[PDB]
Design a protein around this ligand. Sequence first.
Ligand SMILES: Cc1c(C(F)(F)F)nc2ccc(CCc3nc(N4CCCC4)nn3C)nn12
Ligand SMILES: [Mg+2]
Ligand SMILES: [Zn+2]
Length: 313
Amino acid sequence: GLMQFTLPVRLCKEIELFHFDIGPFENMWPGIFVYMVHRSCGTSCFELEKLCRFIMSVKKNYRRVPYHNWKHAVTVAHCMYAILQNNHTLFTDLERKGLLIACLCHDLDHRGFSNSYLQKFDHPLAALYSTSTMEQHHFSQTVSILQLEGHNIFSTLSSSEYEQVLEIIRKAIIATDLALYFGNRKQLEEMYQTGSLNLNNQSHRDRVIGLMMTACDLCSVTKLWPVTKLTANDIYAEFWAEGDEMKKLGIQPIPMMDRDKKDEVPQGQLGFYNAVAIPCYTTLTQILPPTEPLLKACRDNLSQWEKVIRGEE
Ligand SMILES: Cc1c(C(F)(F)F)nc2ccc(CCc3nc(N4CCCC4)nn3C)nn12
Ligand SMILES: [Mg+2]
Ligand SMILES: [Zn+2]
């Protein structure tokens, strides 16, 4: 009850900034996450015994893949922590509780393969869920871990509050299917610009939280250049493995996933920043002005890839 978590001074300070890296010591990520729940939600949101037990069960169910791993989960949760703290009065007691959990859980049991690879391989999960295949698997794994004895971190919530919070986590986790983002951003664009955007319309919050989820999920482009550059290695290491698997089933993989097309990486990073990240963080800054630093940071990294193309590094 009176048991704070505290972080070394550098982490206590740097953790409040959007571009914070959680570092290479796996063993402190749980402490960091708790620390964020406590400052973000209150020391009373969750029973410490149950939360710790849930954190460690979630960790166990992420896999040793290059990118979509436990470090991605806590990274995505920290970006969300930063958004919540720079917009504190805008979000319900329940939304604060659910969204940090949604980010931790959003890639549960990822195998390092896209929805398309499950479909082309004919993986059972593609039969169970026709669209947002892995994302419905992710929500599913969240509910599994929430039902393990001693893991109900929501046990204090009323019947209806519990259903509302699980429904926030469901839509939150679905929204991380980037195929849905393009349409989600476009509507939020129109709504903002015609002045029809209304945060009391629950279907408008849903979209806004959706965009926040894309923003957190992509936050690896909003870090200091050396962190962004090195993460891209992990991202490409999964995609090229999926490329190899595609060739195994007798399919030319899209160039993104062809390791033979290593050389066009900086050109592909440009496309991605221009077609995906820049728009994401633009619309998000318009809707939530204190998130501007994600946009500024994203721009800087775009500029760093331009420098790579021109052989300035
Ligand atoms: C940095 C990053 C993130 C995140 F935000 F999460 F960090 N999420 C993604 C998703 C895709 C990509 C690769 C972009 C791309 N590469 C290519 N290739 C063609 C031939 C060689 C390169 N085409 N495209 C579109 N990066 N990425
Ligand atoms: Mg995902
Ligand atoms: Zn993710």
